[PDB]
Amino acid sequence: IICSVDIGIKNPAYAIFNYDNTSNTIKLIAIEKSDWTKNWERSVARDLTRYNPDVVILEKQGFKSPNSKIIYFIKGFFYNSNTKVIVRNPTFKGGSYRNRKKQSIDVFIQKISEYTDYKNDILNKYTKLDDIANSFNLGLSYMESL
Amino acid sequence: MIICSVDIGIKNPAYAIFNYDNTSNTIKLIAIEKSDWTKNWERSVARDLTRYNPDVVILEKQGFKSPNSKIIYFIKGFFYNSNTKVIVRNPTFKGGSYRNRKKQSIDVFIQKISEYTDYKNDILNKYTKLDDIANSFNLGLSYMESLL
Amino acid sequence: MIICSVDIGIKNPAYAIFNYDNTSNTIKLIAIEKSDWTKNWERSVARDLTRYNPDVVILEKQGFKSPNSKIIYFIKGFFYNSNTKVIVRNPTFKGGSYRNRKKQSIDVFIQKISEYTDYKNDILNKYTKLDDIANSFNLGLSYMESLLK
Amino acid sequence: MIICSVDIGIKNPAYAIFNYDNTSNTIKLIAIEKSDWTKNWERSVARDLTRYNPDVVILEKQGFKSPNSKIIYFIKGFFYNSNTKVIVRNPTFKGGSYRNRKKQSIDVFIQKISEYTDYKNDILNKYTKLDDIANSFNLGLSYMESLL
DNA sequence: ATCGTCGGGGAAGTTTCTTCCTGAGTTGA
DNA sequence: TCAACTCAACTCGTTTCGAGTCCGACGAT
Numbered sequence: 247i248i249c250s251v252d253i254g255i256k257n258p259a260y261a262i263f264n265y266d267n268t269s270n271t272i273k274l275i276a277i278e279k280s281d282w283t284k285n286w287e288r289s290v291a292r293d294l295t296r297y298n299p300d301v302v303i304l305e306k307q308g309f310k311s312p313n314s315k316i317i318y319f320i321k322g323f324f325y326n327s328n329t330k331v332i333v334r335n336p337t338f339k340g341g342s343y344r345n346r347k348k349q350s351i352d353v354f355i356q357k358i359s360e361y362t363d364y365k366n367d368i369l370n371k372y373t374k375l376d377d378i379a380n381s382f383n384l385g386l387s388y389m390e391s392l
Numbered sequence: 393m394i395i396c397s398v399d400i401g402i403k404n405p406a407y408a409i410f411n412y413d414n415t416s417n418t419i420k421l422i423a424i425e426k427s428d429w430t431k432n433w434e435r436s437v438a439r440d441l442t443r444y445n446p447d448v449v450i451l452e453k454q455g456f457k458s459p460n461s462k463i464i465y466f467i468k469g470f471f472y473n474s475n476t477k478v479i480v481r482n483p484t485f486k487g488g489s490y491r492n493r494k495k496q497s498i499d500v501f502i503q504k505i506s507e508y509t510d511y512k513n514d515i516l517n518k519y520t521k522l523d524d525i526a527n528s529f530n531l532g533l534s535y536m537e538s539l540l
Numbered sequence: 541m542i543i544c545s546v547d548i549g550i551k552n553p554a555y556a557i558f559n560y561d562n563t564s565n566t567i568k569l570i571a572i573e574k575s576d577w578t579k580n581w582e583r584s585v586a587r588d589l590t591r592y593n594p595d596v597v598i599l600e601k602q603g604f605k606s607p608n609s610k611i612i613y614f615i616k617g618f619f620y621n622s623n624t625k626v627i628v629r630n631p632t633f634k635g636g637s638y639r640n641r642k643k644q645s646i647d648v649f650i651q652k653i654s655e656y657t658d659y660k661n662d663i664l665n666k667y668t669k670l671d672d673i674a675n676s677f678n679l680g681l682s683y684m685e686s687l688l689k
Numbered sequence: 690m691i692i693c694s695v696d697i698g699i700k701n702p703a704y705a706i707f708n709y710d711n712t713s714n715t716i717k718l719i720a721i722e723k724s725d726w727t728k729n730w731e732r733s734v735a736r737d738l739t740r741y742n743p744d745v746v747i748l749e750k751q752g753f754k755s756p757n758s759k760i761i762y763f764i765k766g767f768f769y770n771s772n773t774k775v776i777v778r779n780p781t782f783k784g785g786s787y788r789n790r791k792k793q794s795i796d797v798f799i800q801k802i803s804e805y806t807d808y809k810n811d812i813l814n815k816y817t818k819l820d821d822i823a824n825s826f827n828l829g830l831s832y833m834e835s836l837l
Numbered sequence: 838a839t840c841g842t843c844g845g846g847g848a849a850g851t852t853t854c855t856t857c858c859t860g861a862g863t864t865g866a
Numbered sequence: 867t868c869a870a871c872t873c874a875a876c877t878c879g880t881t882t883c884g885a886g887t888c889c890g891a892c893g894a895t
Contacts, residue, residue, distance in 0.1 A: 284881060287882090291472060314462075318465040319468060320469065323470065325466075453882090458862070482876095486875095490859070491859090582765065605891095610762045613760075613766070614762045614769075618766035618767070620731060621770060750853080753854095754853095
């Protein structure tokens with residue numbers, strides 16, 4: 247069970263998948279944009295223990311945002327536990343910054359439907375800038391490169 | 393009631409382990425040591441903090457610009473959902489910048505150690521670089537003073 | 541009366557040396573000089589002020605939040621021995637903006653020097669900044685004008 | 690040589706006049722007084738300093754917060770001519786508490802006052818207050834120890 | 838003194854300002 | 867990590883990493 251997280255005080259988001267390795271049996275369990283402003287450490291632990299994951303995928307950031315403190319908190323929380331937290335270098339923000347639309351809507355409209363069967367169920371009531379894109383793209387890139 | 397107060401730092405981290413007798417207000421020094429968190433610092437932090445299975449972990453607050461902050465949240469996440477509360481206390485000595493901070497720390501240490509360990513000479517004779525174990529001891533003792 | 545009026549300051553101190561006739565009430569400008577007190581100011585003050593051993597030394601009142609006050613009190617102690625009266629006058633040019641003092645000072649200086657030196661041009665060329673020698677000249681001349689009563 | 694140590698202040702200035710026998714290290718206290726510099730402080734200062742013709746005058750350095758600095762520079766200009774060495778020493782007891790600054794001062798005072806005058810009758814019966822003449826005497830004695 | 842505004846290290850000698858020297862961030866390799 | 871370079875207050879949640887406060891210097895009356 248794979249859990250990919252877009253970290254940030256802006257709009258944190260997480261996606262929970264189950265991927266059968268090398269078998270191309272992808273199952274999307276959930277995708278959500280949460281809020282980590284009220285009791286953020288308690289809220290982070292509560293959101294991470296919902297569907298106890300085996301791997302957590304994060305985007306590495308510099309000093310740009312306090313979201314790094316969430317990265318180190320997550321590393322400490324799941325350290326001895328069975329899960330393994332891995333922080334991937336930022337693909338995101340390479341050269342230009344006006345390249346979201348293409349990859350976001352393309353990968354969504356192409357690949358969300360075959361895994362959850364609730365494509366438009368989330369589309370009709372979710373709309374945000376750079377949370378579902380970062381989280382889903384990190385998770386899907388890890389799974390495709392897996 | 394096992395107290396573990398830590399002076400944080402990647403180069404010279406230090407920790408003091410006290411025993412506070414509940415309802416008796418009895419301070420008994422269990423141990424005081426310093427370690428190194430250079431190679432795979434997460435393993436070293438976890439081991440040094442779980443060494444004596446404490447009930448409270450005391451850390452000293454740093455500003456928003458230091459690697460010591462990264463250790464703070466790792467420890468907070470590590471001991472979260474446990475019967476071991478990590479608390480981040482303000483800097484005990486917050487007066488003089490350099491000449492008063494370290495010297496006042498090691499002075500109050502050398503003066504207040506005698507009533508707690510009964511092994512004063514053996515600890516003073518080893519290190520001679522006291523300004524980390526001194527900070528940890530002062531942090532722990534300040535937390536205990538704030539207990540009553 | 542050999543009179544020495546001083547515009548005080550570490551960076552560019554200045555002084556004007558006059559001769560005042562006691563029974564004629566006539567002004568005579570002897571000299572006007574800039575100096576430097578940026579290094580060893582007590583030695584420099586003692587040297588520059590005793591250069592033309594005066595009978596009166598006039599200083600301009602300074603506030604307490606300036607090094608000119610310590611120079612004032614050093615001079616007070618120095619000449620408190622004999623033969624030299626140190627007198628501290630209120631700033632002659634007073635009021636309005638601070639820069640209005642400088643321009644008014646150098647203006648009255650430029651327009652009133654000709655009647656005293658006959659070497660007006662040598663002073664305008666050497667030491668082009670005029671806002672210290674003006675202060676010293678105006679201080680001395682104001683004291684001597686206030687001497688009649 | 691005749692040594693004159695001054696506790697400066699418009700509040701209650703004080704001075705101690707010692708006589709040091711040259712090459713014998715014999716300290717003899719000539720006088721101790723609490724003067725007043727209220728009206729025409731320059732005249733009063735000059736009178737009090739020229740009362741006993743000294744060879745050195747010892748002052749305690751002050752911060753630029755009080756007219757005592759103007760008195761210091763007045764003294765420097767006054768004795769600058771010749772014959773005198775005005776020395777401005779920092780306040781001797783540069784340590785511990787401020788409330789203990791007077792305690793140790795008057796302690797060293799009461800410790801060493803008896804051995805210097807041999808006419809301590811009028812002086813013992815004279816005054817019930819110390820916290821100015823004590824400071825002046827301690828400054829003077831510190832210079833006397835720093836003399837050899 | 839008094840209201841508005843600003844900066845926030847220590848020690849010693851060239852002394853009440855200047856000239857240093859600390860010892861911790863912080864920053865690119 | 868690490869070695870050169872730059873530069874000095876505290877501090878509380880401000881639902882606990884950054885935006886808030888406090889306390890002595892100047893400037894101009």
